[PDB]
Short mmCIF file of N, CA and C in Angstrom, two decimals:
data_model
loop_
_atom_site.label_atom_id
_atom_site.label_comp_id
_atom_site.label_asym_id
_atom_site.label_seq_id
_atom_site.Cartn_x
_atom_site.Cartn_y
_atom_site.Cartn_z
N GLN G 1194 -184.44 -128.66 8.79
CA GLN G 1194 -184.26 -129.15 7.36
C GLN G 1194 -182.21 -130.01 7.14
N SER G 1195 -182.31 -131.20 6.92
CA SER G 1195 -181.43 -131.79 6.86
C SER G 1195 -180.91 -131.45 5.58
N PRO G 1196 -179.78 -130.81 5.65
CA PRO G 1196 -178.91 -131.13 3.91
C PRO G 1196 -178.24 -132.78 3.62
N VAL G 1197 -178.57 -133.58 4.11
CA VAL G 1197 -178.59 -135.14 4.62
C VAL G 1197 -179.63 -135.98 3.87
N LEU G 1198 -179.37 -136.74 2.57
CA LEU G 1198 -180.65 -137.63 2.67
C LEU G 1198 -179.99 -139.06 2.38
N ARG G 1199 -181.16 -140.14 2.96
CA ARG G 1199 -180.34 -141.51 3.45
C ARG G 1199 -181.49 -142.32 2.14
N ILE G 1200 -181.07 -142.61 1.34
CA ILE G 1200 -181.13 -143.69 0.04
C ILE G 1200 -181.13 -145.01 0.05
N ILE G 1201 -181.98 -145.44 -0.10
CA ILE G 1201 -181.61 -147.20 -0.60
C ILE G 1201 -182.59 -147.03 -2.03
N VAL G 1202 -181.53 -147.62 -2.78
CA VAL G 1202 -182.26 -148.22 -4.09
C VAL G 1202 -182.56 -149.42 -4.49
N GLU G 1203 -183.88 -150.27 -4.25
CA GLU G 1203 -184.41 -151.57 -4.58
C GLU G 1203 -184.23 -151.58 -6.11
N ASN G 1204 -184.31 -153.43 -6.09
CA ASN G 1204 -185.15 -153.54 -7.40
C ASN G 1204 -183.60 -153.75 -7.41
N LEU G 1205 -182.47 -153.71 -7.15
CA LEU G 1205 -181.30 -152.99 -7.99
C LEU G 1205 -180.41 -154.59 -8.89
N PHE G 1206 -181.39 -154.00 -9.76
CA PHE G 1206 -181.03 -155.43 -11.47
C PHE G 1206 -179.98 -155.32 -12.25
N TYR G 1207 -179.63 -154.45 -12.11
CA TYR G 1207 -178.30 -153.62 -13.04
C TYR G 1207 -177.44 -152.89 -11.00
N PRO G 1208 -176.10 -152.59 -11.72
CA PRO G 1208 -175.44 -152.35 -10.99
C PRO G 1208 -175.45 -150.45 -10.54
N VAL G 1209 -175.71 -149.77 -9.69
CA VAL G 1209 -176.02 -148.59 -9.28
C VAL G 1209 -174.72 -147.77 -9.44
N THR G 1210 -173.57 -147.62 -9.35
CA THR G 1210 -173.07 -147.17 -8.76
C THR G 1210 -172.68 -145.36 -8.42
N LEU G 1211 -171.78 -144.99 -7.66
CA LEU G 1211 -171.74 -143.95 -6.34
C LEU G 1211 -171.74 -143.05 -7.84
N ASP G 1212 -171.23 -142.63 -8.31
CA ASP G 1212 -170.61 -141.96 -9.60
C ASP G 1212 -172.06 -141.45 -10.35
N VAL G 1213 -173.05 -142.48 -10.76
CA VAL G 1213 -173.98 -142.00 -11.06
C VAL G 1213 -175.81 -141.76 -10.78
N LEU G 1214 -175.34 -141.98 -9.02
CA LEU G 1214 -176.19 -141.12 -7.53
C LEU G 1214 -175.60 -139.67 -7.83
N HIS G 1215 -174.51 -139.51 -7.82
CA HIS G 1215 -173.62 -137.70 -8.12
C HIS G 1215 -174.64 -137.62 -9.51
N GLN G 1216 -174.44 -138.02 -10.20
CA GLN G 1216 -175.11 -137.31 -11.94
C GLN G 1216 -176.27 -136.95 -11.48
N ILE G 1217 -177.14 -138.03 -10.88
CA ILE G 1217 -178.68 -137.46 -10.90
C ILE G 1217 -178.78 -136.60 -9.75
N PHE G 1218 -178.38 -136.94 -8.91
CA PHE G 1218 -178.48 -135.93 -8.38
C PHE G 1218 -178.23 -134.73 -7.78
N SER G 1219 -177.06 -134.65 -8.63
CA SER G 1219 -176.12 -133.15 -8.90
C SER G 1219 -177.14 -132.47 -9.80
N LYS G 1220 -178.57 -132.74 -10.64
CA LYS G 1220 -179.46 -132.06 -10.75
C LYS G 1220 -180.06 -130.77 -9.72
N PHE G 1221 -180.14 -131.32 -9.10
CA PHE G 1221 -181.21 -130.66 -7.93
C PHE G 1221 -180.25 -129.78 -7.01
N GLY G 1222 -178.78 -130.20 -7.19
CA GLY G 1222 -177.95 -129.01 -6.25
C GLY G 1222 -176.39 -129.22 -5.95
N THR G 1223 -175.61 -128.57 -5.52
CA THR G 1223 -173.98 -128.90 -5.48
C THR G 1223 -174.14 -130.49 -4.36
N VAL G 1224 -173.59 -131.51 -5.04
CA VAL G 1224 -173.38 -132.36 -4.20
C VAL G 1224 -171.57 -132.89 -3.35
N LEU G 1225 -171.89 -132.64 -1.77
CA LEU G 1225 -170.94 -132.28 -1.71
C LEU G 1225 -170.06 -133.61 -1.00
N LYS G 1226 -170.92 -134.87 -0.19
CA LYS G 1226 -170.32 -135.87 -0.04
C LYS G 1226 -171.31 -137.41 -0.14
N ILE G 1227 -170.79 -138.41 -1.11
CA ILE G 1227 -171.99 -139.20 -0.84
C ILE G 1227 -170.52 -140.77 -0.67
N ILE G 1228 -171.33 -141.53 0.29
CA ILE G 1228 -171.42 -143.39 1.37
C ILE G 1228 -172.16 -144.19 0.75
N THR G 1229 -171.74 -145.19 0.19
CA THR G 1229 -172.66 -146.82 -0.19
C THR G 1229 -172.25 -146.62 0.68
N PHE G 1230 -173.15 -148.26 0.91
CA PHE G 1230 -173.25 -149.50 1.89
C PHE G 1230 -174.29 -150.48 1.92
N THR G 1231 -174.17 -151.28 2.44
CA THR G 1231 -175.23 -152.41 2.14
C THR G 1231 -175.60 -152.98 3.65
N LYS G 1232 -176.75 -152.64 4.22
CA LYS G 1232 -177.65 -152.43 5.10
C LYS G 1232 -178.77 -153.88 4.88
N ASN G 1233 -179.67 -153.97 5.85
CA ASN G 1233 -180.96 -154.88 5.89
C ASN G 1233 -181.04 -155.96 4.01
N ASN G 1234 -179.37 -155.99 3.73
CA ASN G 1234 -179.51 -156.95 2.46
C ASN G 1234 -180.16 -155.81 1.59
N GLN G 1235 -179.90 -154.83 1.27
CA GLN G 1235 -179.90 -153.27 0.43
C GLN G 1235 -179.03 -152.53 0.44
N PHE G 1236 -179.10 -152.20 -0.49
CA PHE G 1236 -177.85 -151.28 -1.27
C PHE G 1236 -178.40 -149.96 -0.81
N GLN G 1237 -177.75 -149.16 -0.07
CA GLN G 1237 -178.23 -147.80 0.24
C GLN G 1237 -176.75 -146.48 0.01
N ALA G 1238 -177.69 -145.58 0.88
CA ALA G 1238 -176.75 -144.71 0.76
C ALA G 1238 -176.46 -143.49 1.35
N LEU G 1239 -175.82 -142.13 1.85
CA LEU G 1239 -176.45 -141.07 2.29
C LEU G 1239 -175.81 -139.86 1.86
N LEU G 1240 -176.32 -138.88 1.41
CA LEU G 1240 -175.85 -138.16 0.26
C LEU G 1240 -176.13 -136.42 0.97
N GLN G 1241 -174.52 -136.22 1.08
CA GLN G 1241 -174.71 -134.59 1.23
C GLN G 1241 -174.69 -133.50 0.32
N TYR G 1242 -175.85 -132.55 0.31
CA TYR G 1242 -175.83 -131.37 -0.37
C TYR G 1242 -175.44 -129.90 0.84
N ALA G 1243 -175.31 -129.03 -0.56
CA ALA G 1243 -174.40 -128.00 0.43
C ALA G 1243 -175.81 -127.39 0.79
N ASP G 1244 -177.26 -127.24 0.56
CA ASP G 1244 -178.17 -126.68 0.82
C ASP G 1244 -178.62 -127.40 1.05
N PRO G 1245 -180.27 -127.20 1.98
CA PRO G 1245 -180.82 -128.39 2.96
C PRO G 1245 -182.51 -128.29 1.55
N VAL G 1246 -182.22 -126.89 1.16
CA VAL G 1246 -183.43 -127.35 -0.12
C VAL G 1246 -183.09 -127.81 -1.03
N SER G 1247 -181.98 -127.86 -1.61
CA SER G 1247 -181.83 -128.68 -2.48
C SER G 1247 -182.36 -130.39 -1.65
N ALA G 1248 -181.97 -130.90 -1.04
CA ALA G 1248 -181.97 -131.77 -0.51
C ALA G 1248 -183.34 -132.50 -0.34
N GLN G 1249 -184.26 -131.21 -0.37
CA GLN G 1249 -186.14 -131.49 0.03
C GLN G 1249 -186.20 -131.35 -1.73
N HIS G 1250 -185.85 -130.78 -2.60
CA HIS G 1250 -186.17 -131.02 -3.69
C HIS G 1250 -185.71 -132.26 -4.56
N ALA G 1251 -184.85 -132.42 -4.23
CA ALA G 1251 -184.73 -133.57 -4.91
C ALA G 1251 -185.29 -135.07 -3.89
N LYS G 1252 -185.36 -134.76 -3.07
CA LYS G 1252 -186.35 -135.76 -2.74
C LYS G 1252 -188.19 -136.44 -3.21
N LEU G 1253 -188.36 -134.32 -2.79
CA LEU G 1253 -190.01 -134.48 -3.56
C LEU G 1253 -189.78 -134.93 -5.19
N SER G 1254 -188.81 -134.38 -5.90
CA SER G 1254 -188.27 -135.17 -7.51
C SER G 1254 -188.46 -136.64 -7.31
N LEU G 1255 -187.44 -136.84 -6.59
CA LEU G 1255 -186.90 -138.40 -7.70
C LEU G 1255 -187.41 -139.86 -6.59
N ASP G 1256 -188.10 -139.54 -5.35
CA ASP G 1256 -188.69 -140.76 -4.25
C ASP G 1256 -189.53 -141.00 -5.07
N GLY G 1257 -189.52 -142.57 -5.28
CA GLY G 1257 -189.69 -143.59 -6.24
C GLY G 1257 -189.53 -143.81 -7.80
N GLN G 1258 -188.30 -142.98 -8.00
CA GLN G 1258 -188.08 -143.27 -9.35
C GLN G 1258 -187.36 -144.07 -10.13
N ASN G 1259 -187.24 -144.46 -11.18
CA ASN G 1259 -186.53 -145.74 -11.06
C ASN G 1259 -185.35 -145.29 -11.89
N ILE G 1260 -183.99 -145.37 -12.00
CA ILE G 1260 -182.83 -145.02 -12.36
C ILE G 1260 -182.53 -145.09 -13.64
N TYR G 1261 -182.97 -146.53 -14.01
CA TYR G 1261 -183.06 -147.09 -15.12
C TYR G 1261 -184.30 -148.15 -15.45
N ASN G 1262 -184.28 -148.35 -16.81
CA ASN G 1262 -185.87 -148.92 -17.18
C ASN G 1262 -186.17 -149.64 -16.60
N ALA G 1263 -187.24 -150.40 -15.92
CA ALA G 1263 -187.56 -151.08 -14.93
C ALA G 1263 -186.72 -151.87 -14.20
N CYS G 1264 -185.48 -150.78 -12.80
CA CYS G 1264 -184.96 -150.93 -12.01
C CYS G 1264 -184.97 -149.90 -11.36
N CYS G 1265 -183.64 -150.63 -9.78
CA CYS G 1265 -183.57 -149.05 -9.37
C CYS G 1265 -183.85 -148.18 -9.01
N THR G 1266 -185.11 -148.19 -8.57
CA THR G 1266 -186.21 -147.20 -7.83
C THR G 1266 -185.69 -147.01 -6.32
N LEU G 1267 -185.58 -145.33 -6.88
CA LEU G 1267 -185.18 -144.86 -5.12
C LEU G 1267 -186.07 -145.08 -4.13
N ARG G 1268 -185.59 -144.57 -2.77
CA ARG G 1268 -186.51 -144.64 -1.68
C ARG G 1268 -185.14 -143.49 -1.18
N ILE G 1269 -186.22 -142.16 -1.22
CA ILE G 1269 -185.34 -141.20 -0.39
C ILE G 1269 -186.22 -140.65 1.29
N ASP G 1270 -185.51 -140.09 2.42
CA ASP G 1270 -186.26 -139.80 3.29
C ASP G 1270 -185.01 -138.57 4.28
N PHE G 1271 -184.59 -137.96 4.73
CA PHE G 1271 -183.75 -137.16 5.43
C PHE G 1271 -183.25 -138.05 6.77
N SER G 1272 -182.29 -137.68 6.40
CA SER G 1272 -181.53 -138.01 7.66
C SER G 1272 -180.69 -136.93 8.76
N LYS G 1273 -180.78 -137.33 10.17
CA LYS G 1273 -180.86 -136.62 10.98
C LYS G 1273 -179.48 -136.12 11.13
N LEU G 1274 -178.52 -136.26 10.77
CA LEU G 1274 -177.11 -136.95 10.04
C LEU G 1274 -177.37 -134.91 9.86
N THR G 1275 -175.82 -134.36 10.34
CA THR G 1275 -175.91 -132.43 9.59
C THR G 1275 -174.85 -132.78 8.64
N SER G 1276 -174.30 -133.64 8.72
CA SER G 1276 -172.99 -133.82 7.98
C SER G 1276 -172.38 -134.80 7.02
N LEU G 1277 -171.86 -134.95 6.79
CA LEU G 1277 -171.43 -136.30 6.17
C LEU G 1277 -169.32 -136.56 6.56
N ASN G 1278 -168.89 -137.49 7.28
CA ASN G 1278 -167.48 -137.60 7.55
C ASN G 1278 -166.91 -138.83 6.25
N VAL G 1279 -166.16 -138.54 5.51
CA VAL G 1279 -165.58 -139.24 4.71
C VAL G 1279 -164.33 -140.13 4.62
N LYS G 1280 -163.93 -140.53 4.66
CA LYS G 1280 -162.38 -140.81 4.79
C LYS G 1280 -161.61 -141.17 3.33
N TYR G 1281 -162.13 -141.66 3.07
CA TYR G 1281 -161.93 -142.11 1.18
C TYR G 1281 -162.06 -142.18 0.31
N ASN G 1282 -161.47 -141.99 -1.05
CA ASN G 1282 -161.96 -141.27 -2.21
C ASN G 1282 -162.12 -143.23 -2.92
N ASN G 1283 -163.33 -143.23 -3.14
CA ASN G 1283 -163.34 -144.55 -3.72
C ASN G 1283 -164.41 -145.02 -4.12
N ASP G 1284 -164.47 -146.47 -4.33
CA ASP G 1284 -165.86 -146.99 -5.40
C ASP G 1284 -167.30 -146.20 -4.44
N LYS G 1285 -166.95 -146.35 -2.84
CA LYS G 1285 -167.71 -146.36 -1.96
C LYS G 1285 -167.37 -145.12 -1.20
N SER G 1286 -167.09 -144.15 -1.92
CA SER G 1286 -167.18 -143.26 -0.76
C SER G 1286 -166.22 -142.00 -1.64
N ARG G 1287 -167.10 -140.78 -0.97
CA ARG G 1287 -166.72 -140.54 -2.45
C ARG G 1287 -166.60 -138.87 -0.80
N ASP G 1288 -165.95 -137.24 -1.06
CA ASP G 1288 -165.98 -135.99 -0.69
C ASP G 1288 -165.12 -135.05 -2.02
N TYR G 1289 -166.17 -134.78 -2.15
CA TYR G 1289 -166.14 -133.81 -3.58
C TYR G 1289 -165.25 -132.59 -3.08
N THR G 1290 -165.30 -132.05 -1.63
CA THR G 1290 -164.40 -131.01 -1.23
C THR G 1290 -163.26 -131.47 -0.58
N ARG G 1291 -162.99 -132.61 -1.15
CA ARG G 1291 -161.16 -133.12 -0.57
C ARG G 1291 -160.60 -134.10 -1.45
N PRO G 1292 -160.09 -133.70 -2.30
CA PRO G 1292 -159.28 -134.54 -3.28
C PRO G 1292 -157.96 -135.38 -3.01
N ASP G 1293 -157.78 -134.66 -2.10
CA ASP G 1293 -156.74 -135.30 -1.19
C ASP G 1293 -156.37 -136.08 -0.55
N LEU G 1294 -158.14 -137.08 0.29
CA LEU G 1294 -158.16 -138.10 0.82
C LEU G 1294 -157.12 -139.34 -0.37
N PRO G 1295 -156.85 -140.48 0.71
CA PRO G 1295 -156.31 -141.43 -0.07
C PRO G 1295 -157.88 -142.59 -0.57
N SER G 1296 -157.33 -143.39 -1.50
CA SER G 1296 -158.31 -144.53 -1.29
C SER G 1296 -158.31 -145.60 -0.50
N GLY G 1297 -157.55 -145.32 0.47
CA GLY G 1297 -157.60 -146.38 1.32
C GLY G 1297 -156.91 -147.06 2.61
N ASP G 1298 -157.36 -147.59 3.48
CA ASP G 1298 -156.00 -147.36 4.62
C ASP G 1298 -155.58 -146.41 5.20
N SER X 914 -192.83 -147.40 -15.50
CA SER X 914 -191.37 -148.03 -14.31
C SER X 914 -190.61 -147.38 -15.39
N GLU X 915 -190.24 -146.30 -16.58
CA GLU X 915 -189.28 -145.52 -17.38
C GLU X 915 -188.30 -144.97 -15.87
N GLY X 916 -186.75 -144.77 -16.54
CA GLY X 916 -185.62 -144.60 -15.79
C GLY X 916 -185.36 -143.37 -15.90
N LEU X 917 -184.60 -142.99 -15.00
CA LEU X 917 -184.21 -141.29 -15.45
C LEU X 917 -183.49 -141.24 -16.48
N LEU X 918 -182.57 -142.44 -16.71
CA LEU X 918 -180.85 -142.96 -17.24
C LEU X 918 -181.45 -144.01 -18.56
N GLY X 919 -180.76 -143.96 -19.30
CA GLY X 919 -180.67 -145.38 -20.71
C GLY X 919 -179.11 -146.01 -20.48
N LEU X 920 -179.96 -147.47 -20.72
CA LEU X 920 -178.48 -148.50 -20.73
C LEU X 920 -178.38 -148.98 -22.60
#
């Protein structure tokens, strides 16, 4: 069981920030790190919980759910990554356990 | 298609 989830937000008709993902996923556990990126022309993210069960719970509860009315559908799967490496704290990545990280470069 | 949060 992996504590890291791979997330794709489809039908992105309104901006979804890293902080909004933190808000939504924090309901199911302690979010340690989040990194967002664009691939295959889709907004995606990797999110790490402290507990693999929290990841499982979030996937069951949130997969296929819209973040906002009529848009921003979450597609969630487990990642084989056992943890995440975050270099910076900014709009694209965040390590909630390391407030000392630079925002870039 | 309701959402988790409001706008």
